[PDB]
Design an enzyme around this catalytic site. Structure first.
Site, PDB file in Angstrom:
ATOM      1  N   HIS A   1       0.847  -1.194   0.000  1.00  0.00           N
ATOM      2  CA  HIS A   1       0.000   0.000   0.000  1.00  0.00           C
ATOM      3  C   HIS A   1       0.886   1.250   0.000  1.00  0.00           C
ATOM      4  O   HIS A   1       1.823   1.341   0.798  1.00  0.00           O
ATOM      5  CB  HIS A   1      -0.899  -0.022   1.248  1.00  0.00           C
ATOM      6  CG  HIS A   1      -2.116   0.850   1.177  1.00  0.00           C
ATOM      7  ND1 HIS A   1      -3.396   0.336   1.194  1.00  0.00           N
ATOM      8  CD2 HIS A   1      -2.254   2.197   1.170  1.00  0.00           C
ATOM      9  CE1 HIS A   1      -4.272   1.324   1.163  1.00  0.00           C
ATOM     10  NE2 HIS A   1      -3.605   2.469   1.151  1.00  0.00           N
TER      11      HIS A   1
ATOM     12  N   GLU B   1      -3.412   0.985  -5.032  1.00  0.00           N
ATOM     13  CA  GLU B   1      -3.925   1.830  -6.111  1.00  0.00           C
ATOM     14  C   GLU B   1      -2.769   2.213  -7.039  1.00  0.00           C
ATOM     15  O   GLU B   1      -2.016   3.157  -6.766  1.00  0.00           O
ATOM     16  CB  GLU B   1      -4.639   3.056  -5.536  1.00  0.00           C
ATOM     17  CG  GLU B   1      -5.957   2.708  -4.825  1.00  0.00           C
ATOM     18  CD  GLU B   1      -6.675   3.922  -4.250  1.00  0.00           C
ATOM     19  OE1 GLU B   1      -6.146   5.052  -4.333  1.00  0.00           O
ATOM     20  OE2 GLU B   1      -7.793   3.742  -3.717  1.00  0.00           O
TER      21      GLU B   1
ATOM     22  N   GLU C   1     -12.139  -0.653   0.027  1.00  0.00           N
ATOM     23  CA  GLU C   1     -12.357   0.634   0.663  1.00  0.00           C
ATOM     24  C   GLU C   1     -13.674   1.218   0.184  1.00  0.00           C
ATOM     25  O   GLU C   1     -13.995   1.159  -1.004  1.00  0.00           O
ATOM     26  CB  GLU C   1     -11.259   1.656   0.351  1.00  0.00           C
ATOM     27  CG  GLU C   1      -9.872   1.216   0.805  1.00  0.00           C
ATOM     28  CD  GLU C   1      -8.778   2.210   0.442  1.00  0.00           C
ATOM     29  OE1 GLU C   1      -9.087   3.368   0.092  1.00  0.00           O
ATOM     30  OE2 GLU C   1      -7.586   1.822   0.508  1.00  0.00           O
TER      31      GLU C   1
END
Length: 368
Positions: A114, A160, A294
């Site tokens: 992350h 992401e 999320e």
């Protein structure tokens, strides 16, 4: 223990330990792509203003009704040898301490990679080989260290991936490199064998936007180990949607149910269930799990916090229930930040005995 991805996700209603183990090293740029182990990096969980995570913090999340925790982890500033992507032993120990707190208190766990910016910010042909080598080496080390944990622990390979400051649709090049990340992750974890042969692995769409994976085979389902089919993998996306309500505060209200309370986005209850049905038809029906890794609505209101917060309760109940009934797991975002505006995703006050400061969220997820 042996659970498929769909079995693992069933009825999982989870919570993110946000802005803790994915912070950068103290005093360092979160957008840096450097790999190392700078002085003080073992204190990274406090680098963005949050406290040291304690067992009682984990236990309070369980007692609120959550049955899983997603733990964002940044690794790039905890690397003792960039060539081998060896991980600082103290950092591994700290993560295992927190993972153990979760597992010992009846929680499923996701650990991931992350804000790993050398990987996330460079999805191009120029860096594909280097990044796949480093990701392979990094996951070999993570998967080996966590190999003996039971099926309640799942791995998510990336977070992401996207060019810095670009949140839009990937190029064909971007998408090829990012799909390669997912395959490399599955390859090296399954190669460690043992408990990792059937562990739940969670794979991301591009920048975790489901619309960048759900069309035209844009998201490529990896080839898993022989015999696994698609049954031990999930597709992950993040779902702060519609962003004009959940993220950037353009709208204070959402849904045809609240169309008389204030302006609402065009995206409504049907838009969301149509999308969830599309994910079922595209991914679930091929045997994959679905992880909403999320989601959340930032605390915001121009006036009438009571009615705005009632609508957020409705939104939370609708999203989590419609996802759960289709077999998805969900994990709400929580960054311990409170206020009125953007990035205000705190639910529990981690500085004050996990006091519930956003009860409208928990009332929507779990009921009044």
């Amino acid at each position: 223990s042996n659970a498929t991805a769909q079995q693992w996700n069933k009825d999982v209603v989870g919570w993110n330990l946000g802005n803790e183990f994915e912070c950068s090293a103290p005093g360092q740029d979160g957008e840096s792509m450097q790999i190392g182990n700078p002085d003080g990096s073992i204190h990274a969980e406090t680098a963005w203003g949050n406290p040291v995570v304690t067992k009682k913090m984990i236990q309070a999340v369980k007692k609120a009704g959550f049955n899983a925790i997603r733990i964002p982890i940044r690794w790039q500033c905890h690397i003792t040898n960039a060539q081998a992507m060896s991980i600082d032993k103290a950092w591994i120990a700290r993560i295992k301490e927190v993972v153990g707190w979760c597992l010992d208190n009846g929680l499923k766990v996701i650990i991931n990679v992350h804000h790993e910016k050398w990987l996330e910010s460079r999805p191009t042909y120029q860096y594909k080989e280097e990044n796949c080598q480093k990701l392979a080496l990094l996951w070999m080390n993570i998967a080996s260290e966590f190999a003996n944990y039971d099926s309640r622990l799942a791995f998510a390979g990336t977070n992401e991936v996207h060019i810095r400051d670009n949140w839009g649709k990937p190029t064909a090049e971007n998408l090829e490199v990012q799909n390669a990340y997912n395959q490399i992750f599955v390859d090296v974890v399954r190669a460690t064998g043992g408990n990792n042969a059937k562990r739940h692995l969670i794979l991301q769409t591009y920048v975790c936007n489901p619309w960048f994976g759900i069309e035209n085979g844009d998201f490529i389902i990896p080839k898993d180990a022989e015999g696994n089919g698609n049954n031990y993998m999930s597709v992950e996306f993040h779902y702060y949607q519609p962003w004009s309500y959940a993220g950037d505060c353009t709208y204070d209200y959402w849904g045809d149910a609240y169309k008389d309370a204030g302006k609402i986005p065009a995206d409504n209850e049907k838009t969301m269930t149509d999308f969830f049905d599309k994910a079922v038809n595209t991914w679930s029906n091929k045997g994959l799990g679905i992880v909403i890794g999320e989601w959340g609505v930032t605390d915001h209101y121009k006036s009438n916090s009571e009615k705005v917060h009632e609508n957020m309760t409705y939104y939370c109940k609708f999203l989590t229930t419609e996802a759960r009934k289709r077999g998805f797991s969900t994990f709400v975002w929580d960054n311990n930040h409170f206020g009125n505006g953007s990035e205000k995703y705190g639910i529990f006050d981690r500085f004050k005995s996990m006091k519930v400061n956003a009860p409208w969220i928990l009332e929507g997820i779990f009921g009044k």
